[PDB]
Structure 1
Amino acid sequence: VVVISQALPVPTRIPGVADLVGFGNGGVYIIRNSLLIQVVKVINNFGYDAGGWRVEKHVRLLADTTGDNQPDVVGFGENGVWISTNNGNNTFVDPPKMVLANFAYAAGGWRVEKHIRFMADLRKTGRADIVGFGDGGIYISRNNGGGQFAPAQLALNNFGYAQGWRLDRHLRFLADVTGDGLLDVVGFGENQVYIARNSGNGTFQPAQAVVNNFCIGAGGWTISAHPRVVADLTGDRKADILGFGVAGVYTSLNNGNGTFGAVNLVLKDFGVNSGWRVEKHVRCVSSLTNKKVGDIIGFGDAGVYVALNNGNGTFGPVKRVIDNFGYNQGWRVDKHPRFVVDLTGDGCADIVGFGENSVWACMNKGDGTFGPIMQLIDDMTVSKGWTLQKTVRYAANLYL
């Protein structure tokens, strides 16, 4: 089940044994999930010093652009889109190749502060197309294989800067809301959540308002205080809506056809009223049990809090599953990336954090409870010069 969000543009597999990837000063480095835990440099590019890559101008992702289920390195650079393909053996093509003179800072006028760039398999080809929410609307470049990307085309004249879409007010996602397996657009706009149905052919149907909530102008949902996710809360592979609001967690369940039901307060925690603050805490939805549905995970003050989904979008009690990864243990949103991702292959998401001095993990027992914290390795951390301003780090399934 693939959902692409602004916060998590690189989806991960359930089950999986996700790797760690880092775009450091000197290039691209990986920690292969395996019996030997080490940092390996794979490309002398896509780095602050290796190619002049900047977080304020360029976009760096992992995505399968060839169709072999081994994600490639994709960077939206200064004058075009650059790709280093995955060789399958802990190496990548170096140097990367320039596949399209668009979607770039000085080619097409793309801006981190104004626009969104994703890679997604929008036509079920098995290959990721380039997808951008730009000025005029959503632009796609078809991945025709073999490094051949077609000229960018307007997929739909909406969800663009020109239609009032703003990173400081609104949210945009790609997610299948119909069940046909095609990722549709989900946008939390000014006054409505809208969807736009993927027609399969590089176009989206007109925006349709589905929910008059979860937006700044409909309920007072703000970017700085009230995060929102799109995720399957029921198990039918159709995405639902979840928001962390003031009183707690609100949901709107998919009716099954890309229309959405009533908005309900389903849990009185993980909200502003329980102390949660975007500036100090991390809130995620991931599958932590064999039910294969969105459970709630929060990196709070004292540790990690979890509420398990009963299977139908209603939730059990909140339990502090570990007394670590929290604000009280030194964890800072502007320094220490945290992800909820299967690292062990059992289908139950685990925890990994890039800490001050070590990368730390903590493994799901298989039932949504967790074991003790493990120090994985002393690298890819603040202490080794990895900052949010100069580097990008992800959990990603590089080998499949």
Structure 2
Amino acid sequence: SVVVISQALPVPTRIPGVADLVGFGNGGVYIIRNSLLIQVVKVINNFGYDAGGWRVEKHVRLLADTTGDNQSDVVGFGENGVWISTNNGNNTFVDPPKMVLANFAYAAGGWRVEKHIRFMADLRKTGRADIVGFGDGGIYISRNNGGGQFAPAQLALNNFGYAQGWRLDRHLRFLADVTGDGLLDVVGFGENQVYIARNSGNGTFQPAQAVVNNFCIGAGGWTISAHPRVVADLTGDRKADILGFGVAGVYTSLNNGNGTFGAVNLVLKDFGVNSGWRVEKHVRCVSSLTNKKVGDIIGFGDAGVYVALNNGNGTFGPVKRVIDNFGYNQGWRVDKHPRFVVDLTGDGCADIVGFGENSVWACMNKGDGTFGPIMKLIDDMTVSKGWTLQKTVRYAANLY
């Protein structure tokens, strides 16, 4: 499946891939390299709660390739600017980080976790991640001109910003290719319409175009607290479609192929509020689990993990419980135990990793959307080793 950057998952992972694990702990940054030797390595004495005063409430911490060598660097939007530790290539990183731009920060430009969104993305096909922010007046970009040189921020589009009424408690904003040129476009679930804005590839987006009168707070009664929405390729043409977990179950609107969108249809009477699914209890994801390389549905429910496989065209097979674990009944909690659907093995069929109370656990896809046994990875990066959602940030990420 394709590169989509979302609020929930701001660090995309590759399909196929062998993702690593990265934790911003109280003491700094730690990695678990996906390899024959599984261990935790501390790489940076910074970007932590007690290593630089980093706070989930004020600061943003991401991974992105900022040089074009396909190795992920550590990027932090700190108190007064953007800080970067680059990947040295050998399971080490530059420490300390350097400040590349005095903007996109709590005390540089007045950026706020409660009002604004900050991502890193290669928006101009340079091979390097630019800084992209949904701020007050619209979307701002700072161009990554290479050699650690980031240009002053410029307005990319006067839309999708706080000034245009966009709110984190009502609306959703994504970056995803909806046209097929490989450039990430804006997809925004607004007050009463889904909008797209076409990336021109030059640090600007085209005027926003309304494409769907649904999936929004004021179009079908879609709420942030009950009804998660995602953007993903459901058909295999590498153009993103829309999928929402609504009241009756799963609704889609399929891309016509040019970034306009078709009718909204209920495609599966499961994974929705009426089947007992709750944002506070459960995790719902779309990722490629099969050799069809299309979005399949995965839900971490009460009794375990449930999967519905896409036939290749956006229609879905029966729901099956594939793993009797990682579920609310087994003690897993949204507010304690991060769970990700990510390729860990390199076959293109996403696997499961969960940061449990005591250990990190994985479960491998057999290659067909069914799963083997649960595997212990390590006894670290967990609640009992001092990791909480309030004070730490954890990701699956392809470091290399």
Range into which the TM-score falls when normalised by the shorter chain? over 0.9
Aligned mates of 2:201, 2:354 — CA distance in 1: 37
CA offset at residue 289 of structure 1? 0.3
Deviations 1:200-229 (A, max 9, x none): 110011110000000000000000000000
Match of 2:164 in 1: 163
Aligned mates of 1:34, 1:178 — CA distance in 2: 36
CA offset at residue 54 of structure 1? 0.3
Aligned mates of 1:15, 1:181 — CA distance in 2: 17
Aligned mates of 1:378, 1:181 — CA distance in 2: 39
Does residue 371 of structure 2 align to residue 370 of structure 1? yes
3-state SS of paired residue (1:328): helix
CA offset at residue 329 of structure 1? 0.3
Aligned mates of 1:47, 1:121 — CA distance in 2: 26
Aligned mates of 1:279, 1:94 — CA distance in 2: 37
Aligned mates of 1:305, 1:185 — CA distance in 2: 30
Match of 1:351 in 2: 352
3-state SS of paired residue (1:343): coil
Deviations 1:304-356 (A, max 9, x none): 00000000000000000000000000000000000000001111100000000
Aligned mates of 2:50, 2:95 — CA distance in 1: 15
Aligned mates of 1:71, 1:33 — CA distance in 2: 14
CA offset at residue 130 of structure 1? 0.3
Match of 2:222 in 1: 221
Deviations 1:269-322 (A, max 9, x none): 000000000000000000000000000000000000000000000000000000
CA offset at residue 394 of structure 1? 0.1
1:1-400 matched pairs, under 5 angstroms: 1-399=2-400
What TM-score, normalized by structure 1, do the two folds share? 0.99
Aligned mates of 1:257, 1:215 — CA distance in 2: 22
Aligned mates of 2:188, 2:358 — CA distance in 1: 38
3-state SS of paired residue (2:371): coil
Identity among equivalent pairs (%) = 99
3-state SS of paired residue (1:105): coil
CA offset at residue 14 of structure 1? 0.8
Aligned mates of 1:283, 1:235 — CA distance in 2: 21
CA offset at residue 245 of structure 1? 0.2
CA offset at residue 70 of structure 1? 0.4
Aligned mates of 1:59, 1:134 — CA distance in 2: 14
Deviations 1:66-116 (A, max 9, x none): 001001000000000000000110000000000000000000000000000
Give ranges in structure 2 of 5+ residues lacking alignment.
none
What TM-score, normalized by structure 2, do the two folds share? 0.99
3-state SS of paired residue (2:133): strand
3-state SS of paired residue (1:394): strand
3-state SS of paired residue (1:83): strand
CA offset at residue 375 of structure 1? 1.1
Runs of 4+ in 1 over 4 A off after TM superposition: none
Deviations 1:3-23 (A, max 9, x none): 000000000011111000000
3-state SS of paired residue (1:130): strand
Aligned mates of 1:119, 1:295 — CA distance in 2: 26
Q: How many residues align?
A: 399
3-state SS of paired residue (1:363): strand
3-state SS of paired residue (2:22): strand
